[PDB]
Design a protein around this ligand. Structure first.
Ligand SMILES: C[C@H](Oc1ccnc(-c2noc([C@@]3(C)CCCc4sc(N)c(C#N)c43)n2)n1)[C@@H]1CCC[N@H+]1C
Ligand SMILES: Nc1nc2c(ncn2[C@@H]2O[C@H](COP(=O)(O)OP(=O)(O)O)[C@@H](O)[C@H]2O)c(=O)[nH]1
Ligand SMILES: [Mg+2]
Length: 168
């Protein structure tokens, strides 16, 4: 049967989680997507010659640590932790997202990719070296993306699938 991979996109508001997701789903850059909409979106894709079904949860809204929200996030098999390369605060938030993923998955070994989005913009405030070194600290891949140009989009999502495959 066709394997389904449940991927969850997390990170600060405004980093481009929705734009990245929609580039994967629609193959279109959407510069405006209601910042409060949290939803999941499926798409069949070929990854290393194997058709699989991606189910991508694009997170949004208020930080909440209820049992219900933990259970919803626990359905994720792998996580994209997204910051924007022109927003230092979004990068400084990453460790919090990673810690919460480790907690809900009750595992030090959750499939994960660090994503530095908005790589098309000149206003960089987070050095590539610093982001690469954070991914190294965590032992995870780092992918530079742009939802605007499609740079890195498949790399980010497909790497996460490959990481889930390895973990399984
Ligand atoms: C960085 C923070 O801000 C926000 C703002 C919005 N969201 C978060 C946030 N942290 O983890 C999560 C996820 C969605 C990630 C996947 C696993 C779980 S499990 C569960 N229950 C979750 C939730 N809510 C999550 N989201 N954090 C700073 C720092 C602390 C104060 N705060 C202002
Ligand atoms: N230049 C540029 N703008 C982006 C990119 N991704 C998202 N944006 C913009 O960043 C803002 C927030 O994007 P959105 O997808 O809503 O972020 P979310 O809150 O993480 O879902 C919007 O103004 C988008 O147009 C990108 O890669 N490049
Ligand atoms: Mg959004």
């Amino acid at each position: 049967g066709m394997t389904e991979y449940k991927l969850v996109v997390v990170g600060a508001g405004d980093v481009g989680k929705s734009a990245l997701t929609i580039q994967l789903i629609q193959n279109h850059f959407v510069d405006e997507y209601d910042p409060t909409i949290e939803d999941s979106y499926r798409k069949q894709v070929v990854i290393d010659g194997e058709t699989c079904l991606l189910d991508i949860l694009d997170t949004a809204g208020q930080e909440e640590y209820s049992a219900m929200r933990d259970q919803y996030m626990r359905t994720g098999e792998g996580f994209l932790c997204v910051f924007a390369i022109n927003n230092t605060k979004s990068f400084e938030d990453i460790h919090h997202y990673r810690e919460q993923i480790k907690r809900v998955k009750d595992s030090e070994d959750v499939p994960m990719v660090l994503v530095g989005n908005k790589s098309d913009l000149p206003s960089r405030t987070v050095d590539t070296k610093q982001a690469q070194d954070l991914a190294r600290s965590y032992g995870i891949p780092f992918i530079e993306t742009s939802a605007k140009t499609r740079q890195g989009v498949d790399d980010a999502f497909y790497t996460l699938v490959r990481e889930i495959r390895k973990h399984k």
